[PDB]
Amino acid sequence: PPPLLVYKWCQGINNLQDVWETSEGECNVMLESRFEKMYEKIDLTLLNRLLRLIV
Amino acid sequence: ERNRPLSDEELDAMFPEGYKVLPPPAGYVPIRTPARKLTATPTPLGGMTGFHMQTEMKSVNDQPSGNLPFLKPDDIQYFDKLLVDVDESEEQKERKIMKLLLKIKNGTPPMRKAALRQITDK
Amino acid sequence: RLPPEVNRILYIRNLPYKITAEEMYDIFGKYGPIRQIRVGNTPETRGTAYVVYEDIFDAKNACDHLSGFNVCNRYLVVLYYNANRAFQKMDTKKKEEQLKLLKEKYGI
Amino acid sequence: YIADRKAREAVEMRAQVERKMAQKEKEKHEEKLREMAQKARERRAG
Amino acid sequence: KLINELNEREVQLGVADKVSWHSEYKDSAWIFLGGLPYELTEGDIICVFSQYGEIVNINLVRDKKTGKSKGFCFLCYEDQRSTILAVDNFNGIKIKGRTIRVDHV
Amino acid sequence: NLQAQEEEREFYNARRREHRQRNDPGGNNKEKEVPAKEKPSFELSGALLEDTNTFRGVVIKYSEPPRWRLYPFKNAYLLGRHPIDHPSCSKQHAVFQYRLVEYTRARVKPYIIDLGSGNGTFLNNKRIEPQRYYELKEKDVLKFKDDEDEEEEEEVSD
């Protein structure tokens, strides 16, 4: 379930190797975004060739 | 019981008209004879199957003509002769047209009615 | 542990008109020894075949794994063949000689 | 369409390549195992 | 054969326990196994019917002169619910090709 | 006062019991509770056929070490004389039931069990006594005066 995903995400961060160590000047970056228009910009002609690779 | 071995006249007894018996080889037939011994032997041997990823015709038959209400997956065995579309060239056409049975068995109630009369008067 | 309706005979369809009995014997020969196999050589029955094995469970494993199995572009129709129907084309006779034999050899 | 034809052809070629590289390995494995077995039988004789 | 159809009218109609016709008895362990195969013997039927209980003593009817089974046995368990279980369960069973019958006594 | 009653009783097994419960004839050596095929136990090991554990058989005719076939154990197996026995053997010394080879779980491990064949069976040219499962390890040898053949076991590797 989505909240459990949030938990996997947090402990996933905290389990990374030396994640919080700033000693040498390490820098962490969290980035969140959207694809903006994604559905609307899918091209049918391309989508056909892309599906031909699958099914 | 029903597993008792059979004879070629008994073999000709079951299947209907118009089929041929084949040997492909004498050798593949010897494979079929060793197959019993090799059902034990080759099952105890190296074997496996795998698939490769590669890009890619698909024939099939329902009962088409105009309509032909649907065939259950088993009933094909009975009605297979109707599936082939070869048409219009005696008795074979009476058996072929007699598939109106299929219209009695499966279909809409009106198809069953009209079919039933049509076969009564014939 | 088997359904009664299945029988040692299997009706097999969705076959090509060029298909070779070599491929037939090879493929079908996995599950057990072939009792024999027939193939329609007649205008309507071309594309169909019947397979018969020395044992039923052979055919059971067959239709198990061969269900919708592929050849060329085709997925073969694999069904357990019916019984009775059109039979009496042949007769019941020729029992007398063999029964006289089993009555002679073993004497029983 | 061109990219698809040439692409399928290329991946096909790569496929026969991987298969060709595979069969040699299989036969090497079977010969190796047969050698181990023959050595085992020889150790069984003495 | 009639039993199994009585258990189906008892389950289908929602009889709900104590009105069950195994409450007909309450007094009796000994069960009746008829239609038994002639090759069977004491230790055997004991080994098959000790499944649903612990059988104390069984007298199988075997013809006095020839000394072979007449084909049925009256059995006695240590527990009644074993009898209820056995009649309601073990009946309509195949043994050596022939279906045995069981019922109270 | 020799025989009081001529019949008495038995309290013994019936032929139709043990018959119906085991039939190919009736057989002996019903599989124990553990038995499971080796391939699925290589599936719980997460092993494709490359790294999977498959036991292949090796034949040497006892007179000449110089394959009549090669046999997989992966697909228990009934080692007998030939029809009943699955693993048929042309050896004329094998009783109608000679022995059995069952893979059991203790891990998926191969086991050989003698059925008490009249002659016996030699393991590494050293016999084992009847009626107990004896684990086999790779490269071990089996032979069914009466030994016309030999056998060896191999795991699939390299």
PDB file of N, CA, C and O in Angstrom, chain F residues 123-157:
ATOM      1  N   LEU F 123      27.314 -51.975  -3.198  1.00  0.00           N
ATOM      2  CA  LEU F 123      27.546 -50.537  -3.235  1.00  0.00           C
ATOM      3  C   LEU F 123      29.038 -50.281  -3.100  1.00  0.00           C
ATOM      4  O   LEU F 123      29.626 -50.566  -2.052  1.00  0.00           O
ATOM      5  N   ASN F 124      29.643 -49.732  -4.152  1.00  0.00           N
ATOM      6  CA  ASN F 124      31.097 -49.594  -4.221  1.00  0.00           C
ATOM      7  C   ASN F 124      31.764 -50.951  -4.038  1.00  0.00           C
ATOM      8  O   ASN F 124      32.832 -51.059  -3.430  1.00  0.00           O
ATOM      9  N   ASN F 125      31.111 -51.991  -4.560  1.00  0.00           N
ATOM     10  CA  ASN F 125      31.511 -53.383  -4.365  1.00  0.00           C
ATOM     11  C   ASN F 125      31.459 -53.765  -2.885  1.00  0.00           C
ATOM     12  O   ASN F 125      32.151 -54.677  -2.426  1.00  0.00           O
ATOM     13  N   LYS F 126      30.620 -53.058  -2.127  1.00  0.00           N
ATOM     14  CA  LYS F 126      30.373 -53.366  -0.723  1.00  0.00           C
ATOM     15  C   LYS F 126      28.873 -53.317  -0.473  1.00  0.00           C
ATOM     16  O   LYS F 126      28.266 -52.246  -0.549  1.00  0.00           O
ATOM     17  N   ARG F 127      28.283 -54.461  -0.137  1.00  0.00           N
ATOM     18  CA  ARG F 127      26.832 -54.559  -0.054  1.00  0.00           C
ATOM     19  C   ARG F 127      26.295 -53.830   1.173  1.00  0.00           C
ATOM     20  O   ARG F 127      27.022 -53.528   2.122  1.00  0.00           O
ATOM     21  N   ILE F 128      24.997 -53.532   1.133  1.00  0.00           N
ATOM     22  CA  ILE F 128      24.271 -52.980   2.271  1.00  0.00           C
ATOM     23  C   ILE F 128      23.139 -53.930   2.633  1.00  0.00           C
ATOM     24  O   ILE F 128      22.577 -54.606   1.762  1.00  0.00           O
ATOM     25  N   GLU F 129      22.810 -53.981   3.918  1.00  0.00           N
ATOM     26  CA  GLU F 129      21.762 -54.862   4.410  1.00  0.00           C
ATOM     27  C   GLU F 129      20.391 -54.292   4.082  1.00  0.00           C
ATOM     28  O   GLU F 129      20.228 -53.086   3.893  1.00  0.00           O
ATOM     29  N   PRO F 130      19.372 -55.147   4.016  1.00  0.00           N
ATOM     30  CA  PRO F 130      18.076 -54.709   3.487  1.00  0.00           C
ATOM     31  C   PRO F 130      17.309 -53.825   4.459  1.00  0.00           C
ATOM     32  O   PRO F 130      17.624 -53.746   5.648  1.00  0.00           O
ATOM     33  N   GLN F 131      16.300 -53.143   3.915  1.00  0.00           N
ATOM     34  CA  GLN F 131      15.266 -52.436   4.668  1.00  0.00           C
ATOM     35  C   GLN F 131      15.789 -51.236   5.453  1.00  0.00           C
ATOM     36  O   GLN F 131      15.374 -51.017   6.595  1.00  0.00           O
ATOM     37  N   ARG F 132      16.700 -50.447   4.887  1.00  0.00           N
ATOM     38  CA  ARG F 132      16.947 -49.098   5.376  1.00  0.00           C
ATOM     39  C   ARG F 132      17.405 -48.192   4.239  1.00  0.00           C
ATOM     40  O   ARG F 132      18.195 -48.602   3.383  1.00  0.00           O
ATOM     41  N   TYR F 133      16.925 -46.951   4.252  1.00  0.00           N
ATOM     42  CA  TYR F 133      17.378 -45.966   3.284  1.00  0.00           C
ATOM     43  C   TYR F 133      18.851 -45.658   3.500  1.00  0.00           C
ATOM     44  O   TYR F 133      19.272 -45.331   4.613  1.00  0.00           O
ATOM     45  N   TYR F 134      19.635 -45.763   2.434  1.00  0.00           N
ATOM     46  CA  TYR F 134      21.055 -45.450   2.474  1.00  0.00           C
ATOM     47  C   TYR F 134      21.349 -44.308   1.514  1.00  0.00           C
ATOM     48  O   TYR F 134      21.252 -44.474   0.294  1.00  0.00           O
ATOM     49  N   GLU F 135      21.710 -43.153   2.070  1.00  0.00           N
ATOM     50  CA  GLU F 135      22.058 -42.006   1.247  1.00  0.00           C
ATOM     51  C   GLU F 135      23.192 -42.357   0.293  1.00  0.00           C
ATOM     52  O   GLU F 135      24.129 -43.086   0.630  1.00  0.00           O
ATOM     53  N   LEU F 136      23.094 -41.835  -0.922  1.00  0.00           N
ATOM     54  CA  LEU F 136      24.171 -41.943  -1.886  1.00  0.00           C
ATOM     55  C   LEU F 136      24.823 -40.587  -2.097  1.00  0.00           C
ATOM     56  O   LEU F 136      24.155 -39.551  -2.122  1.00  0.00           O
ATOM     57  N   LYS F 137      26.133 -40.617  -2.282  1.00  0.00           N
ATOM     58  CA  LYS F 137      26.928 -39.440  -2.578  1.00  0.00           C
ATOM     59  C   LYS F 137      27.459 -39.580  -3.993  1.00  0.00           C
ATOM     60  O   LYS F 137      27.553 -40.691  -4.519  1.00  0.00           O
ATOM     61  N   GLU F 138      27.782 -38.452  -4.613  1.00  0.00           N
ATOM     62  CA  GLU F 138      28.170 -38.461  -6.017  1.00  0.00           C
ATOM     63  C   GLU F 138      29.364 -39.384  -6.231  1.00  0.00           C
ATOM     64  O   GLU F 138      30.184 -39.564  -5.329  1.00  0.00           O
ATOM     65  N   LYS F 139      29.423 -40.003  -7.415  1.00  0.00           N
ATOM     66  CA  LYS F 139      30.524 -40.863  -7.847  1.00  0.00           C
ATOM     67  C   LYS F 139      30.444 -42.248  -7.220  1.00  0.00           C
ATOM     68  O   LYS F 139      31.268 -43.113  -7.528  1.00  0.00           O
ATOM     69  N   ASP F 140      29.463 -42.473  -6.351  1.00  0.00           N
ATOM     70  CA  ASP F 140      29.249 -43.806  -5.808  1.00  0.00           C
ATOM     71  C   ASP F 140      28.792 -44.760  -6.913  1.00  0.00           C
ATOM     72  O   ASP F 140      28.298 -44.348  -7.965  1.00  0.00           O
ATOM     73  N   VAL F 141      28.969 -46.055  -6.669  1.00  0.00           N
ATOM     74  CA  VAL F 141      28.786 -47.061  -7.707  1.00  0.00           C
ATOM     75  C   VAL F 141      27.761 -48.091  -7.257  1.00  0.00           C
ATOM     76  O   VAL F 141      27.723 -48.489  -6.090  1.00  0.00           O
ATOM     77  N   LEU F 142      26.927 -48.526  -8.201  1.00  0.00           N
ATOM     78  CA  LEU F 142      25.961 -49.587  -7.970  1.00  0.00           C
ATOM     79  C   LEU F 142      26.107 -50.689  -9.010  1.00  0.00           C
ATOM     80  O   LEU F 142      26.408 -50.431 -10.179  1.00  0.00           O
ATOM     81  N   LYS F 143      25.896 -51.922  -8.558  1.00  0.00           N
ATOM     82  CA  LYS F 143      25.751 -53.085  -9.422  1.00  0.00           C
ATOM     83  C   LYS F 143      24.632 -53.943  -8.851  1.00  0.00           C
ATOM     84  O   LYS F 143      24.600 -54.198  -7.645  1.00  0.00           O
ATOM     85  N   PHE F 144      23.715 -54.374  -9.716  1.00  0.00           N
ATOM     86  CA  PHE F 144      22.421 -54.891  -9.283  1.00  0.00           C
ATOM     87  C   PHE F 144      22.513 -56.095  -8.356  1.00  0.00           C
ATOM     88  O   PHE F 144      21.571 -56.374  -7.608  1.00  0.00           O
ATOM     89  N   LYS F 145      29.228 -62.520  -9.329  1.00  0.00           N
ATOM     90  CA  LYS F 145      28.737 -63.679 -10.072  1.00  0.00           C
ATOM     91  C   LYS F 145      27.474 -63.339 -10.853  1.00  0.00           C
ATOM     92  O   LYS F 145      27.332 -63.706 -12.025  1.00  0.00           O
ATOM     93  N   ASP F 146      26.534 -62.654 -10.209  1.00  0.00           N
ATOM     94  CA  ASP F 146      25.287 -62.244 -10.835  1.00  0.00           C
ATOM     95  C   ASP F 146      25.298 -60.796 -11.317  1.00  0.00           C
ATOM     96  O   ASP F 146      24.271 -60.315 -11.809  1.00  0.00           O
ATOM     97  N   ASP F 147      26.419 -60.088 -11.192  1.00  0.00           N
ATOM     98  CA  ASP F 147      26.494 -58.688 -11.600  1.00  0.00           C
ATOM     99  C   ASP F 147      26.965 -58.615 -13.047  1.00  0.00           C
ATOM    100  O   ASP F 147      28.133 -58.883 -13.345  1.00  0.00           O
ATOM    101  N   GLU F 148      26.053 -58.244 -13.943  1.00  0.00           N
ATOM    102  CA  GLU F 148      26.385 -58.051 -15.346  1.00  0.00           C
ATOM    103  C   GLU F 148      26.683 -56.600 -15.702  1.00  0.00           C
ATOM    104  O   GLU F 148      27.149 -56.337 -16.816  1.00  0.00           O
ATOM    105  N   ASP F 149      26.442 -55.657 -14.791  1.00  0.00           N
ATOM    106  CA  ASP F 149      26.490 -54.242 -15.125  1.00  0.00           C
ATOM    107  C   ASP F 149      27.135 -53.464 -13.985  1.00  0.00           C
ATOM    108  O   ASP F 149      27.493 -54.020 -12.942  1.00  0.00           O
ATOM    109  N   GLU F 150      27.288 -52.160 -14.206  1.00  0.00           N
ATOM    110  CA  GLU F 150      27.718 -51.207 -13.191  1.00  0.00           C
ATOM    111  C   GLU F 150      26.920 -49.927 -13.385  1.00  0.00           C
ATOM    112  O   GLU F 150      26.272 -49.739 -14.418  1.00  0.00           O
ATOM    113  N   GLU F 151      26.982 -49.042 -12.394  1.00  0.00           N
ATOM    114  CA  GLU F 151      26.310 -47.754 -12.476  1.00  0.00           C
ATOM    115  C   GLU F 151      27.075 -46.719 -11.668  1.00  0.00           C
ATOM    116  O   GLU F 151      27.725 -47.052 -10.674  1.00  0.00           O
ATOM    117  N   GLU F 152      26.988 -45.463 -12.099  1.00  0.00           N
ATOM    118  CA  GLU F 152      27.586 -44.343 -11.390  1.00  0.00           C
ATOM    119  C   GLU F 152      26.622 -43.165 -11.421  1.00  0.00           C
ATOM    120  O   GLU F 152      25.744 -43.074 -12.282  1.00  0.00           O
ATOM    121  N   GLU F 153      26.797 -42.266 -10.460  1.00  0.00           N
ATOM    122  CA  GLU F 153      25.950 -41.098 -10.291  1.00  0.00           C
ATOM    123  C   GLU F 153      26.769 -39.834 -10.495  1.00  0.00           C
ATOM    124  O   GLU F 153      27.936 -39.769 -10.100  1.00  0.00           O
ATOM    125  N   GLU F 154      26.159 -38.828 -11.122  1.00  0.00           N
ATOM    126  CA  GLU F 154      26.846 -37.556 -11.302  1.00  0.00           C
ATOM    127  C   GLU F 154      25.873 -36.403 -11.105  1.00  0.00           C
ATOM    128  O   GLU F 154      24.766 -36.424 -11.642  1.00  0.00           O
ATOM    129  N   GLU F 155      26.286 -35.402 -10.334  1.00  0.00           N
ATOM    130  CA  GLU F 155      25.590 -34.126 -10.369  1.00  0.00           C
ATOM    131  C   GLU F 155      26.009 -33.360 -11.620  1.00  0.00           C
ATOM    132  O   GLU F 155      27.098 -33.559 -12.164  1.00  0.00           O
ATOM    133  N   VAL F 156      25.142 -32.469 -12.079  1.00  0.00           N
ATOM    134  CA  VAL F 156      25.410 -31.710 -13.292  1.00  0.00           C
ATOM    135  C   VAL F 156      26.176 -30.460 -12.886  1.00  0.00           C
ATOM    136  O   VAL F 156      25.646 -29.587 -12.190  1.00  0.00           O
ATOM    137  N   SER F 157      27.436 -30.390 -13.306  1.00  0.00           N
ATOM    138  CA  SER F 157      28.270 -29.219 -13.088  1.00  0.00           C
ATOM    139  C   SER F 157      29.390 -29.236 -14.117  1.00  0.00           C
ATOM    140  O   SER F 157      29.739 -30.287 -14.660  1.00  0.00           O
TER     141      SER F 157
END
